[PDB]
Amino acid sequence: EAIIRIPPYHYIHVLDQNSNVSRVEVGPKTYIRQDNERVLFAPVRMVTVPPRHYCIVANPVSRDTQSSVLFDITGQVRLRHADQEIRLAQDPFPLYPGEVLEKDITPLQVVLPNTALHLKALLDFEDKNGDKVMAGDEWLFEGPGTYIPQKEVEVVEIIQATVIKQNQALRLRARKECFDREGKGRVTGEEWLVRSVGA
Amino acid sequence: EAIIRIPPYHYIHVLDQNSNVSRVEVGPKTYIRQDNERVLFAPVRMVTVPPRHYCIVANPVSRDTQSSVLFDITGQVRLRHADQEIRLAQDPFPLYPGEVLEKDITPLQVVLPNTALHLKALLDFEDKNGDKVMAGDEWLFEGPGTYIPQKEVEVVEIIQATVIKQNQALRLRARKECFDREGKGRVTGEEWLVRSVGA
Amino acid sequence: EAIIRIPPYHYIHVLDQNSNVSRVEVGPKTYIRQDNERVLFAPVRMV
């Protein structure tokens, strides 16, 4: 059917069968298609993101200074084929051609007061404070709070703080050459003891 | 049938099959539909809220300064796709398009004099007094009274105050680093004793 | 069919089934009709 039935917060993709340009048409409009706006898929929901949630979209659209979705000379959208994008709470964002939802809608990542996250960088990048990060650095997201799940970082594990009662101690074994809480250099495998009470 | 039979406190949804605009038509009126006001569902009751009750409506309508239901340029209602809304006692409110009743009609939440509610914030928000709240803070709704059930907070559990008779005491174990009633810093797992008589 | 195929020097009549208004639509345009622009007759020559 040449008439297409797009609800107010839905969109579809149309291919220009004369110039290969795929472009997303969003409602609200009762749209008409010739065979230069050939429909690809259905007006299906195109679900949005609830507040304090996040999504990973693969091959995102390049955005200008004003965060404007860029297009090519032919009119095709400007993608980031070698990147992803983390979408936080926002409008029912349009899925431009090539933009495939890498990881679907999901709740956020909140950490308990007495736990931590093993945040390991997968690829080289610079943090918001901007000092330096290797390709494979590991740091510890601390206690009560919430992390912003990024594409350059990965949560290796959740680490529950071990309760140390009085008249007890913890035997720590370093996996790599490093320092400790007090400032004593620890070589790999050198087991030491911490007597601090608490968690 | 082109004639539609809307009782005084009922409403339905009509789609404009020319511009995709879905809009709610409320009685009282014997309404007439062309194929630009195509009916979606029945004039079924559209139940209201009794006093001192609450409902959760998903994807609520955006409201202006005068709490006016906003519409888009095309005429479609302005929703909050990434939010909910708590509706207290009021008129048989109209369910605008997209507005789906997340949680149906229910009684309120009243607390016994010797019990409390474990109110944990699920998402970051600011309370009415407006000081600060984390994404995962926990506080205790106190005894005799009634809480206003919000979307940003969750009742983890109901906690009945434990009766402490004279010549008796309670062994309290802190789950996290914190303070106590008297002002003594308690580390995780450090069991202490409270000898106050009462509940 | 909701899509109507009007040659450059042809025209048809459309009735607004909501207000009875009949009005002539002339090409050239590949016109679209809802049931407020109901076509009456063909795009025939109109000599």
Q: Spell out which residues of chain C touch residue B36, defining contact as CB-CB under 8 Å.
A: 18, 34-36
Q: Spell out which residues of chain B touch residue A149, defining contact as CB-CB under 8 Å.
A: none
Contact B70, B37 (CB under 8 A): no
CA distance A36 to A22: 10
CA distances from B186 to A140, B90, B174, B178, B180 (A): 24, 46, 7, 5, 7
Scored b (16 or more CB within 10 A) or e, B10-32 reads: bbbbbbbbbbbbbbbbbbeeebe
CA distance B153 to B150: 6
Tokens 């898929």, located at residue? A41
Q: Which ranges in chain A belong to alpha helices (H)?
A: none
Any idea what DSSP says for residue A34? Answer: -
Contact B62, B72 (CB under 8 A): no
Contact B94, B26 (CB under 8 A): yes
> Chains touching chain A at 3 or more Cβ pairs under 8 angstroms?
B, C
Q: Cβ–Cβ of A52/B97 closer than 8 Å? A: no
CA distance A17 to A38: 7
CA distance C32 to C22: 16
CA dihedral A108, A114, A115, A116 (to 10 degrees): 90
- The half-sphere exposure of A88 on its side-chain side, counting CA atoms within 13 A, is 6
Contact B13, B43 (CB under 8 A): no
* Amino acid in the structure at residue C1: E
* Amino acid in the structure at residue A81: H
> Chains touching chain B at 3 or more Cβ pairs under 8 angstroms?
A, C
CA distance B33 to C18: 9
- Indicate the pairing of strand B109-111 with strand B145-147: antiparallel
CA-based diameter of chain C, in Å? 31
Tokens 């303070």, located at residue? B179
For residue C31, the chain A residue with the least C-alpha distance is A32
CA distance B188 to C2: 72
Any idea what DSSP says for residue B167? Answer: T
CA-based diameter of chain A, in Å? 81
Question: Which residue from B23, B38, B37, B27 is spatially nearest to B77, judged by alpha carbons?
Answer: B23
Q: Cβ–Cβ of C3/A30 closer than 8 Å? A: no
Scored b (16 or more CB within 10 A) or e, B53-71 reads: ebbbbbbbbeeeeeeebee
User: B26 forms bridges with which residues in the sheet?
Assistant: B11
Q: Cβ–Cβ of A198/B177 closer than 8 Å? A: yes
Question: Which residue from A115, A77, A118, A119 is spatially nearest to A98, judged by alpha carbons?
Answer: A77
Residue positions counted in chain B: 199
Residue positions counted in chain A: 199
CA distance C28 to A2: 19
Question: Between A and C, how many CB-CB pairs are < 8 A?
Answer: 11
CA distance B59 to B99: 5
Contact B188, A199 (CB under 8 A): yes
Q: Which two tokens stand for residue A94?
A: 């349009």
User: Could you give the 3-state DSSP secondary structure of residue A14?
Assistant: strand
Our CA-based measurement puts residue B91 at a distance from the nearest CA of chain A, in whole angstroms, of 27
Tokens 């206003």, located at residue? B148
For residue B18, the chain A residue with the least C-alpha distance is A30
